[PDB]
Design a protein around this nucleic acid. Structure first.
Ligand SMILES: Nc1ncnc2c1ncn2[C@@H]1O[C@H](COP(=O)(O)OP(=O)(O)NP(=O)(O)O)[C@@H](O)[C@H]1O
Ligand SMILES: Nc1ncnc2c1ncn2[C@@H]1O[C@H](COP(=O)(O)OP(=O)(O)NP(=O)(O)O)[C@@H](O)[C@H]1O
Ligand SMILES: Nc1ncnc2c1ncn2[C@@H]1O[C@H](COP(=O)(O)OP(=O)(O)NP(=O)(O)O)[C@@H](O)[C@H]1O
Ligand SMILES: O=C(Nc1ccc(Br)cc1)c1ccc(Br)c(S(=O)(=O)NCc2ccccc2)c1
Ligand SMILES: O=C(Nc1ccc(Br)cc1)c1ccc(Br)c(S(=O)(=O)NCc2ccccc2)c1
Ligand SMILES: O=C(Nc1ccc(Br)cc1)c1ccc(Br)c(S(=O)(=O)NCc2ccccc2)c1
Ligand SMILES: [Mg+2]
Lengths: 310, 310, 310
DNA sequence: TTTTTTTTT
């Protein structure tokens, strides 16, 4: 990803890119993917500075018709961080892909908050072992972030705890309004240094009670839409894997049906439905993935994170 | 479709047709179907160059009253690419027609992007097998284009993967503004070589979040109208089949009702409502087609694309 | 309707009537109903040739005060083609009258494009069966003309398909500018031979996207006004029935309200609001007719056109 | 004059 200063060398004033920075653009792809009104909304930017900036953004970033063979190549050179459970990796055909959005929902105690802790330490791994050689960042809305589990999985893999903890960045969000500002600050960090995956634990927990619907329902869904649209751009412009978790309602007609509705159902690329088995064993079923066929597999929650039963 | 150079042989200056080209006209039908102000808007074109160009466009393209018998003939010689599921073809009475717009909507996981992957490979087929002997082009707004499925269906039909992948053209759109520029570049390609169908996967996904309505609603609908009007001209002047997909809202009155409103409901010629059955089985119900009576049929999503259950 | 040559026998030069012909006048009523400036606008016509031509036009066409009894007679000898559904005919008190404008609007799939296909074949019928013994002409702006339905209704009534298809004339319009030229060519045909009804399917579909308002709204409405004024003269001077269809917007105040505004609302004589019932059943409600009281009735869309449920 | 959006327990 080319920094936003590379088009400063193409007839753009300095305070212009500086204002784009407070707007939130830090690379040239963030501008090339941006629509016209997103840019015009910046206060102190004309309507012709806009067509110029978009022109050199399109010059520096190819945004036209290619053919399927070149897309097939990149699709083969994606990274797909492993999950730490060999059968889960077989189900996902290699693990959580980079550059897309995954979703994990379930009743409770189903380990959807523990898979995240496992991934946050597995990402720091050489590719010959299933990692991505990049830092993680963790956005929590519940307070359930526990570094004691990262330490256990770090000992499982050999990595030192101090070296896994000069790593995954913690930010606890108190508001649906605060989540988006965290996304801005996260974009800054991800441009200044290399990151492998973002984790939004309970991406929908705060909405359920911030927006007391119905009558507030339409605004809740509109806010979710924008949040997911921002996550999508982060994924597309930084190649990071985005993993979100989701809560569950009880379908009362006379039955889990995760929350969020059609707006999250359409937005998410891959969804994983987690169940409760015997003891530590859990069942993970594939839910809405194009390439992956519908199937399910088993895994366990050990003292070292996601496992196999075991 | 006659190229735009054939009227350059009728008293038109060369830079005139060259400027029509940057305007976007590449055939004589693109000009014959164009209104007067569409042409006057081109900078460097008079108001009399306009009546001239329209005069020889109407000379080269018959645009008057015919009688029903000659329309009945062409209606019988349309192509109607097959879908790859024998019962779906029976429901559609031969498959997706060429020269019109079809629409497929549904909750999620209902295989409306998998039908697109099947069609993108079925189009490259001799007419004695249900194809159209033409390339496809795929416009994606979500990232869900996977050539791994085109490869599977190519093995089902015998065609070689390298020969199905020197084919369907991929372009990922990041903006409602970018979709239209993609349409221009697509018109260029479709005039320079033969194409069979265009696929706009998630034709309405980007609007839902680009235009945060209401107050932006009227502009969103006006942009959709122009996008669909351009698709209609592409279809009419190149005989390609246009297949678009559509998302769904939850009708909250006290219930799917696809998104887009009356502007897409009126514009689309045939609509298909997809449902979720048991396992891989899905149900496809006819929705707003003149000739086709309202009915429904079943089909399955196999490891080789759309099937039959099976 | 007397041809325009009958006043050529009253001291008018031949090239004068020939120029009136390119102007668009083909009968003496087209001139008697024409205002003065309509005629003066013809290039190569003086201002005294005008008062002369108007003088003998008024001599040949009575345009003064009559009394109500003689109007009551013609009102009783109008034709009112049937619709093909006995309850619809009871609602309309005999069907679609000749010499006026009717309007049918609705969301979509409501059969307003199928009633037109039924009428286009019902018009070719002896008066003792509800027809008008005249050809039809169909102006399409969407491409939804299907002779396969005319064939089905022709088999329902006994008439042979080849004899219903040496009949209804098809012309597809691509522009609001092209609609009017089609009207001119239609006037020529209707004077050279007998016609019973004109059908403008989607009379307002092209305006919604040709005129991107507001700022273009006032011009859009002015163009609609002229189009409807020309339809009115066609109806008055040829006794044909004019049936137009109309799309729908969503009334957003906090609700269908067809498009076109006060200009089409005032111009249309009778309006029919179509709804969606169960299965094939639809509901047709009377909307703005002087003589007809407000009421509604049911009908169905069968494999042979408009029906009864059935 | 023009333009629909949004599930929860
Ligand atoms: N240190 C540990 N060693 C072994 N098992 C543990 C440990 N910590 C938690 N568990 C188990 O992990 C299971 C999964 O809990 P958890 O993943 O936190 O719930 P969750 O998936 O986040 N759902 P939610 O309650 O909505 O957050 C629990 O039922 C515990 O029994
Ligand atoms: N390789 C595959 N083999 C078998 N089944 C598959 C395969 N890939 C995807 N599927 C199934 O295809 C189904 C349809 O998913 P998909 O068509 O991608 O959703 P969609 O129609 O595009 N709706 P949306 O989520 O809004 O894009 C999924 O539920 C999967 O179970
Ligand atoms: N051959 C047929 N046999 C039986 N029913 C049919 C047939 N063709 C179409 N229909 C039905 O006719 C209904 C009316 O569709 P149609 O009349 O074309 O829409 P419309 O009134 O023109 N509204 P619009 O979509 O804006 O054009 C559809 O819902 C179909 O189910
Ligand atoms: O994706 C966008 N921005 C963005 C911002 C921060 C990051 Br990190 C990543 C992406 C984006 C796309 C279209 C429009 Br229009 C706009 S907008 O004009 O600014 N309207 C608010 C809004 C915001 C987000 C999504 C939708 C609407 C933004
Ligand atoms: O269909 C049109 N163009 C087009 C362009 C590219 C392709 Br590929 C295919 C078609 C067209 C029709 C009428 C007018 Br008026 C115009 S306009 O003057 O240029 N206004 C903008 C606009 C654009 C599109 C639809 C509506 C309005 C364009
Ligand atoms: O109804 C008219 N003409 C016509 C033309 C073709 C047919 Br078929 C049927 C009727 C007519 C009436 C008054 C005037 Br003033 C004029 S005008 O001078 O020519 N102005 C343009 C215009 C055209 C139409 C309506 C309004 C204005 C025409
Ligand atoms: Mg899809």
């Amino acid at each position: 990803p080319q920094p936003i200063s590379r088009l400063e060398q193409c007839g753009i004033n300095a305070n212009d890119v500086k204002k784009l920075e407070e707007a939130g653009f830090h690379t040239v792809e963030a501008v090339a993917y941006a629509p016209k009104k997103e840019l015009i909304n910046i206060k102190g930017i004309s309507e012709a500075k806009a067509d110029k900036i978009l022109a050199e953004a399109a010059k520096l970033v190819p945004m036209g018709f290619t053919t399927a063979t070149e897309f097939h190549q990149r699709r083969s050179e994606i990274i797909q961080i492993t999950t730490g459970s060999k059968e889960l990796d077989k189900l996902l055909q290699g693990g959580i892909e980079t550059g897309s959005i995954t979703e994990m929902f379930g009743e409770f105690r189903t380990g959807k908050t523990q898979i995240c802790h496992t991934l946050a330490v597995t990402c720091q791994l050489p590719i010959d072992r299933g990692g991505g050689e990049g830092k993680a960042m963790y956005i929590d809305t519940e307070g359930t972030f526990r570094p004691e589990r990262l330490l256990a999985v770090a000992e499982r893999y050999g990595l030192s705890g101090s070296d896994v903890l000069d790593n995954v960045a913690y930010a606890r969000a108190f508001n649906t309004d605060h989540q988006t500002q965290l996304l801005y600050q996260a974009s800054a960090m991800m441009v200044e240094s290399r990151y492998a995956l973002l984790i939004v634990d309970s991406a929908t927990a705060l909405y359920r009670t911030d927006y007391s619907g119905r009558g507030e329902l339409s605004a809740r869904q509109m806010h979710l839409a924008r949040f997911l649209r921002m996550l999508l751009r982060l994924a597309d412009e930084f190649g990071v894997a985005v993993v979100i978790t989701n809560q569950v309602v009880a379908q009362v007609d006379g039955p889990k049906k995760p929350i969020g509705g059609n707006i999250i159902a359409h937005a998410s690329t891959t969804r994983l439905y987690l169940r409760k088995g015997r003891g530590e064993t859990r069942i993970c079923q594939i839910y809405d993935s194009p390439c992956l066929p519908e199937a399910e597999a088993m895994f366990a929650i050990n003292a070292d994170g996601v496992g196999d039963a075991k």
